């Protein structure tokens, strides 16, 4: 009754990243540092959950990196950033994650949002 509830947000965000988002798509968010910060800095997430998210996704990635060199194979998920950020923007990944975060606060309300 005086907690951030980051853990709930992490597990339920990983559900959004595994069920709603493809693994091959989230690995391209993880591989590039500016892409991940483009998500987190937009979502304004504290370093605690900011890391716990990518670390939980890095356990999903931990089993992959043993055989997959796809991380630096060619680097071209798409030929342009326009082609990447057009079906959905990094602010949409942020939006859906801010929903999950404010739902964690929706249970707790110690972090005085509204």
Curated annotation (Swiss-Prot):
Modification(s) after translation: Phosphorylated by FAM20C in the extracellular medium.
Subcellular location: Secreted
Tissue: Plasma. Found on APOA-I-containing high density lipoprotein (HDL3). Expressed in pancreas, lung, prostate, liver, placenta and spleen.
Subunit details: In plasma, interacts with APOA1 and mainly associated with large high density lipoprotein particles.
Function summary: May play a role in lipid exchange and transport throughout the body. May participate in reverse cholesterol transport from peripheral cells to the liver.
Disorder cited: Focal segmental glomerulosclerosis 4: A renal pathology defined by the presence of segmental sclerosis in glomeruli and resulting in proteinuria, reduced glomerular filtration rate and progressive decline in renal function. Renal insufficiency often progresses to end-stage renal disease, a highly morbid state requiring either dialysis therapy or kidney transplantation.
Family: Belongs to the apolipoprotein L family.
Name the record gives this protein: Apolipoprotein L1
Organism this protein belongs to: Homo sapiens (Human)
Lineage of the organism: Eukaryota, Metazoa, Chordata, Craniata, Vertebrata
